[PDB]
């Protein structure tokens, strides 16, 4: 069960981090690709002009993970579940399914997300901060995974 304290940690830290979301997004994908460079191959549009990490579609993907994870924290506290629109969740499940996104990709992304947050707000970092973000993310991913089918 996701708590008031956890929601607060995610909501506030995101309000802080959102202020520098241009470098946050690059640091996020840099960390994903540092851990698992072959994850690049999942993105069709990455082949793109060098350095390929500049690809303009990477920023909004990174930001979407951040925004929807914070949103999940709020929903988890309020409704006790992730409440993404059924039609959006279907589109998310299908596109991640057909592009061969697997558990290890979601997991590398979680680890990269938490390292990115630690790097971005060292002064707010704590084990409860890590778990708050991590648990919100896990629930978002579980909802996407429920629609990952043909």
Nearer to ligand HEM, 12 or 61 (CB): 61
Q: Using omega within 30 degrees of 0 as the cis cutoff, is the peptide bond preceding 105 cis?
A: no
Interface of this chain with a copy of itself, residues 37 to 56, rule: CB under 8 A: 37-39
Per CB under 8 A, the segment of 1-9, 20-28, 36-44, 45-53 that binds a copy of itself is 36-44
Report what 43 binds from ligand HEM, a copy of itself, none; CB cut-off 5-8 Å by kind.
ligand HEM
- Is 57 annotated to bind ligand? yes
For residues 52 and 40, is the Cβ–Cβ distance under 8 A?
yes
The distance in angstroms from the start CA to the end CA of the chain is 31
Cα–Cα distance between 134 and 129 in angstroms, integer? 8
Minimum distance from CB of 57 to ligand HEM (Å)?
A: 6
Comparing CA positions, the residue from 73, 77, 79, 89 lying closest to residue 136 is 73
Q: Using omega within 30 degrees of 0 as the cis cutoff, is the peptide bond preceding 51 cis?
A: yes
Comparing CA positions, the residue from 76, 107, 66, 63 lying closest to residue 6 is 76
Does residue 95 touch ligand HEM according to CB under 6 A? yes
Interface of this chain with ligand HEM, residues 99 to 118, rule: CB under 6 A: 99, 101, 105-106, 109
H or E stretch including 57? none
Does residue 108 touch a copy of itself according to CB under 8 A? yes
Which residues make up the interface to ligand HEM (CB under 6 A)? Answer: 39, 42-44, 61, 64-65, 68, 91-92, 95-96, 99, 101, 105-106, 109, 137, 140-141, 144
Annotated binding-site residues for heme b read 44, 57, 61, 91, 96
């Amino acid at each position: 069960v996701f708590t008031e304290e956890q929601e607060a940690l995610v909501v506030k830290s995101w309000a802080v981090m959102k202020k520098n979301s241009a470098e946050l997004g690059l640091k996020f994908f840099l960390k994903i690709f540092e851990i698992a460079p072959s994850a690049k191959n999942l993105f069709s549009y990455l082949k793109s002009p060098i350095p390929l990490e500049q690809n303009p579609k990477l920023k909004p993907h990174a930001m979407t993970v951040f925004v929807m994870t914070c949103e999940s924290a709020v929903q988890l506290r309020k409704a006790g579940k992730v409440t993404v629109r059924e039609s959006n969740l279907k589109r998310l499940g299908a596109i991640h399914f057909k592009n061969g996104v697997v558990n290890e990709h979601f997991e590398v992304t979680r680890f990269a997300l938490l390292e990115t947050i630690k790097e971005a707000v060292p002064e707010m970092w704590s084990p409860e901060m890590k778990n708050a973000w991590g648990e919100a993310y896990d629930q978002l991913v579980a909802a996407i995974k429920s629609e990952m089918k043909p």
